[PDB]
Design a protein around this ligand. Structure first.
Ligand SMILES: O=c1ccn([C@@H]2O[C@H](COP(=O)(O)O)[C@@H](O)[C@H]2O)c(=O)[nH]1
Ligand SMILES: O=c1ccn([C@@H]2O[C@H](COP(=O)(O)O)[C@@H](O)[C@H]2O)c(=O)[nH]1
Ligand SMILES: O=c1ccn([C@@H]2O[C@H](COP(=O)(O)O)[C@@H](O)[C@H]2O)c(=O)[nH]1
Ligand SMILES: O=c1ccn([C@@H]2O[C@H](COP(=O)(O)O)[C@@H](O)[C@H]2O)c(=O)[nH]1
Ligand SMILES: O=c1ccn([C@@H]2O[C@H](COP(=O)(O)O)[C@@H](O)[C@H]2O)c(=O)[nH]1
Ligand SMILES: O=c1ccn([C@@H]2O[C@H](COP(=O)(O)O)[C@@H](O)[C@H]2O)c(=O)[nH]1
Ligand SMILES: [Cl-]
Ligand SMILES: [Cl-]
Ligand code: NA
Ligand code: NA
Ligand code: NA
Ligand code: NA
Ligand code: NA
Lengths: 59, 56, 56, 58, 57, 56
């Protein structure tokens, strides 16, 4: 039990806005989180998003 | 197991992002890779890799 | 340990790179740091650090 | 050996920090961790992430 | 894990698409965890993998 | 886990930085994450993450 380990895993199943490093914004639902990836649904599309490409997430 | 960023928990700071934005933020949590903040009525998860520096 | 990218092996995907390029790519291999693809007749080694996201 | 770094040898020194965003910090170094450099810049206190630094002149 | 496909490029002549838009026509002479050593014409370069977007071979 | 950059210690090199700058340098030290150089009269600590490639 390490409380301050990874906050991103708590986003699984949630509606979020993902702000990517190039300025793109994803209105997403999170469908999975790994150490390095966040899986999302955006509209009809399924995306694997690398965390290194994310600047911040609004939730 | 030491990070200076942990010293900023609960504090008002200015986060200078790699995208050029400056967040007027209250820090609500610090993990190894993330900083959780309140900016106005918004809750953000900020990745440390996207931060250039923090003024405190 | 676990990664979702390995499950894309054998799929045809759209890889959106950090430079704004998109690759219409058949995935032929995945390692911790790399994704091997065929794009048309070209064979590429793509570094995961250069990928923003993948549509599958 | 493990965790040797030159950056902590700049601890307590006046330096110029050239950031990836084009900014140059005229800085006094007050602490160095594995991933961060703490600095005073004039009357400002900054936590600078090493990943945002291109090079440091000392 | 901790397999690298890049090691198999040793001895090949490849196109390295760098993160800034430059492209190197490069003979690979060595590969480490973080670096690719190349010959580009008469020039010897150490290329950091973090600066590479992709490699065509 | 080997690194080629260590063998640049003491050598004249040209360092091509991610910002488009080029350093005509002599290497004075190499660590896991840093390369120390002299450029003319200036002493610099260069982070490897900021380097694209090195001509030597
Ligand atoms: O256990 C881990 C490992 C990595 N990351 C995320 O992945 C990024 C690594 O991206 P890269 O620069 O290594 O490609 C980290 O900055 C962090 O955001 C995590 O959240 N947890
Ligand atoms: O234990 C760790 C691991 C990573 N980081 C921060 O997360 C960043 C990861 O960025 P990246 O791996 O995406 O490049 C590091 O540069 C550092 O600022 C930490 O603070 N502590
Ligand atoms: O065991 C690992 C190591 C790395 N990565 C991902 O690959 C990136 C590095 O790949 P590359 O493009 O940098 O070669 C990491 O930041 C992370 O996103 C993984 O998924 N698993
Ligand atoms: O033990 C460490 C870990 C990281 N760093 C610096 O922090 C950066 C964090 O980037 P990354 O490893 O997250 O990609 C490294 O590139 C390096 O400049 C160090 O100096 N020592
Ligand atoms: O064992 C390793 C360690 C790193 N890398 C590559 O080197 C990069 C290091 O650069 P970065 O972590 O600073 O982006 C990794 O992202 C990955 O592409 C490997 O291929 N194998
Ligand atoms: O043992 C290491 C660790 C890092 N690096 C360099 O520092 C960069 C950032 O460190 P990291 O992201 O691999 O931790 C890497 O891309 C690589 O160029 C090395 O040469 N050797
Ligand atoms: Cl929180
Ligand atoms: Cl393959
Ligand atoms: Na981070
Ligand atoms: Na980084
Ligand atoms: Na850092
Ligand atoms: Na590298
Ligand atoms: Na580095």
């Amino acid at each position: 039990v390490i409380p301050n380990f990874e906050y991103a895993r708590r986003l699984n199943g949630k509606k979020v806005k993902i702000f990517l490093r190039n300025g793109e914004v994803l209105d997403a639902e999170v469908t999975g989180v790994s150490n390095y990836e966040i899986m999302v649904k955006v509209g009809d599309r399924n995306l694997l998003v690398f965390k290194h490409a994310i600047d911040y997430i609004e939730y």
